[PDB]
From Swiss-Prot:
Binds to the constant Fc region of IgG with high affinity. This is Immunoglobulin G-binding protein G. Sequence repeats lie at residues 2-56. It is found in: Secreted, Cell wall. The chain holds residues 228 to 282 of 448 of the full protein. It comes from the Bacteria. The lineage of its organism: Bacteria, Bacillati, Bacillota, Bacilli, Lactobacillales.
Length: 56
């Protein structure tokens, strides 16, 4: 119900928390949104840490 999104813009780092019931949909929407905002790197789906990380 709770996930984490860590996106490192090479020179920019930020962490946030959100409570949703559809990570599959949110994860996809956030990816396209982050990319559009200039957020790139390596994304993955961690089940043991239910946390996401992106490194430009």
């Amino acid at each position: 119900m709770q996930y984490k999104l860590i996106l490192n813009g090479k020179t920019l780092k930020g962490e946030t928390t959100t409570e949703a019931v559809d990570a599959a949909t949110a994860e996809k929407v956030f990816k396209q949104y982050a990319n559009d905002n200039g957020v790139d790197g390596e994304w993955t789906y961690d089940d043991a840490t239910k946390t996401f990380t992106v490194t430009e």
